[PDB]
């Protein structure tokens, strides 16, 4: 079983990516859950991560560097809720684009990913509850997953990626 | 989601004199002190717990490291009167309101049936004035007919008066025309510092 | 000079929604974070979310997740907050505000109030408080006008037309479980002045187009 994501345009096959990382917000005011949604931040977020590879993209990072062993959360300042949360992966998830509209990636291994970032998460901000929501809103680029490949840039709606709650 | 807490609410400072209002976090030090006067948004004074805005004047003063911080002013003026804010990211304090301490006066305290013109609409509005006193606690008890009155008033305050520095307070009884024709004496009684004894004003309706 | 303009008062019903806007100049507008305060009257400050608008990103206050959106038009450097569903506590003056790098807040908009009721626009009945021995003390008489029933805010009251201002008192507006408003407004004078000089208070309230002259009597 896979999570489907639209995109437009159709990406074709030869996109298809590793996601390497991903970009956060952490939700702001006050239940003892954390609240984390993709950045609402822009590129100077993106940058400032500095795991990204050649491509451009937002919320996730494809093709990207890898962390050595486990996730590794960084953060400028946890206690400044306008600074995004660089998320970098150890495995990569896979991505593959059928050319047809849809990009594709296991529930298995993002579930699993997701766990493991839940649980740095847990032990940065000494929580119990860590919760993934969708993207709080924005333009094209950053309220959905977009990158470039091959000279044209592409849009695919995350909110299927971000919608889970790990104790 | 850190709380900071600011005391005191309130702060009757004599004039010349220093104040101090404390800001604790319930969790370089990113705090900011505002100053907010009627009708006006917050001012910047202070930034990075300590750094002065410019054109703030040099008796405004920010200290502290971690988890208590602290505003001073040296000297208070009487354009020093205001409400002041603490903040840490995105998160205010409560605000410190800033007066001006004086001596205590005494209220007068006029009472005012009402008016026939009012009884004509089929409502009574019972007025208890508390004039030009300080400090601004003061209790107000309406009595009917010996009975203690609970819920059917309503209170306002003046801000601190510019000239003088006192405080005056309206109190209104408010009942039906029916309800108020069906009692005899209306008495407000008022409890202050200034005051030797509690003062009762009263009348006989009619 | 750094400004930040907003838009002008409103007066909504609850269950509607308000759409305040934040017009800046001075500066580079996709530059700085703009962040949304509130402040009940007599209250304290909230903060409600920021948005950057570089990106129209947004972080909501968890308390109006769902019921706030924040936009922005870069082409004029305007920034918006809707507030929807409102209730009657939602009743507040709404600012916007310009972080800084030493984030902190040094630009403010002048603030929207918003007041949310059920209300309709009501002139106020004015009343005489007539002084008498129960309102005099040691030559000194108090006397006033009742402004009752009222919405919305605010009425202006004066005394003989500007020409009474000494020992003069007009009360903060209280809000009675009627959704009108009403306050007092009241002045000491010689008790020996009471059967020469004519007392009258000057009430305006602009929202209705109420304007009324009272002569307070005495007895
Ligand atoms: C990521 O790398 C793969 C393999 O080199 C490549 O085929 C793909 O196009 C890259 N992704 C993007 C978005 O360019
Ligand atoms: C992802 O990385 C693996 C090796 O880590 C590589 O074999 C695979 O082709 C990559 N996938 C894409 C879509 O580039």
Redesign the interface.
């Known amino acids: 079983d896979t999570i489907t994501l639209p995109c437009r345009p159709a990406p074709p096959p030869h996109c298809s990516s590793n996601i390497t990382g991903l970009i956060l917000?952490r939700?702001?005011?006050?239940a003892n859950t954390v609240?984390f949604?993709p950045?609402?931040?822009?590129?100077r977020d993106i940058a400032r991560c500095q795991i990204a590879g050649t491509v451009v993209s937002t919320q996730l990072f494809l093709n990207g560097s890898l962390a050595e062993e486990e996730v590794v959360i960084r953060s400028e300042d946890w206690?400044?809720?306008?600074k995004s949360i660089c998320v970098q992966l150890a495995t990569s998830v896979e991505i593959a684009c059928t050319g047809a509209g849809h990009c594709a990636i296991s529930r298995a291994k993002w579930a699993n990913t997701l766990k493991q970032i839940a649980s740095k998460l847990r032990e940065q901000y000494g929580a119990k509850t860590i919760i993934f929501k969708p993207?709080?809103?924005?333009?094209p680029?950053?309220?959905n997953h977009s990158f470039n490949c091959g000279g044209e840039f592409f849009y695919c709606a995350s909110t299927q990626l971000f919608a889970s709650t790990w104790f | 989601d850190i709380v900071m807490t600011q005391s005191p609410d309130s702060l009757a400072v004599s004039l010349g004199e220093r104040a101090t209002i404390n800001c604790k976090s319930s969790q370089k030090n990113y705090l900011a002190w505002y100053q907010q006067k009627p009708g006006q948004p917050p001012k910047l004074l202070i930034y990075w717990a300590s750094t002065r805005e410019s054109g703030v004047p040099d008796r405004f003063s920010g200290s502290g490291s971690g988890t208590d911080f602290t505003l001073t002013i040296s000297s208070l003026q009487a354009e020093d009167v205001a409400v002041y804010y603490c903040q840490q990211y995105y998160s205010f304090g409560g605000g410190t309101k800033v007066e001006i301490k004086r001596t205590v006066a005494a209220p007068s305290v006029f009472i005012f049936p009402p008016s026939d013109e009012q009884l004509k609409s089929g409502t009574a509005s019972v007025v208890c004035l508390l004039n030009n006193f300080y400090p601004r606690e003061a209790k107000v008890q309406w009595k009917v007919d010996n009975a203690l009155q609970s819920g059917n008033s309503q209170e306002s305050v003046t801000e601190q008066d510019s000239k003088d520095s006192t405080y005056s307070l309206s109190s209104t009884l408010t009942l039906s025309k029916a309800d108020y024709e069906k009692h005899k004496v209306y008495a407000c009684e008022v409890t202050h510092q200034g005051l030797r004894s509690p003062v009762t004003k009263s009348f006989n309706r009619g | 000079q750094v400004q930040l303009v907003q838009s002008g008062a409103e007066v909504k019903k609850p269950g509607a929604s308000v759409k305040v806007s934040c017009k800046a100049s001075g500066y580079t507008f996709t530059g700085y974070y703009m962040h949304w305060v509130r402040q009940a009257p007599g209250q304290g400050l909230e903060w409600m979310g920021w948005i950057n608008p570089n990106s129209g990103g947004t972080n909501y206050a968890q308390k109006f997740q769902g019921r706030v959106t924040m936009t922005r038009d870069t082409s004029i450097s305007t920034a918006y907050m809707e507030l929807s569903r409102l209730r009657s506590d939602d009743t507040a003056v709404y600012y916007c505000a310009k972080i800084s790098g030493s984030y902190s807040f040094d630009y403010w908009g002048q603030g929207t109030l918003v007041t949310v009721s059920s209300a309709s626009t009501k002139g106020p009945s004015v009343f005489p408080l007539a002084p008498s021995s129960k309102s005099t003390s040691g030559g000194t008489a108090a006397l006033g006008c009742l402004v009752k029933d009222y919405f919305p805010e605010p009425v202006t009251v004066s005394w003989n037309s500007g020409a009474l201002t000494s020992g003069v008192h007009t009360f903060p507006a209280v809000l009675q479980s009627s959704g009108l408003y009403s306050l007092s407004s009241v002045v000491t004078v010689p008790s020996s002045s009471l059967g020469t000089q004519t007392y009258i208070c000057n009430v305006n309230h602009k929202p209705s187009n109420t304007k009324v002259d009272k002569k307070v009597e005495p007895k």
Not at chain 1, 27 to 30: L, M, R, S
Not at chain 1, 39 to 43: A, N
Not at chain 1, 79 to 82: E, F, K, L, S
Request: no cysteine; charged share 25%; proline share 0%.
């Open positions: 917000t939700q702001g005011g006050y609240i949604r950045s609402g931040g822009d590129w206690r400044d809720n306008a993207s709080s809103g924005g333009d680029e950053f309220v």
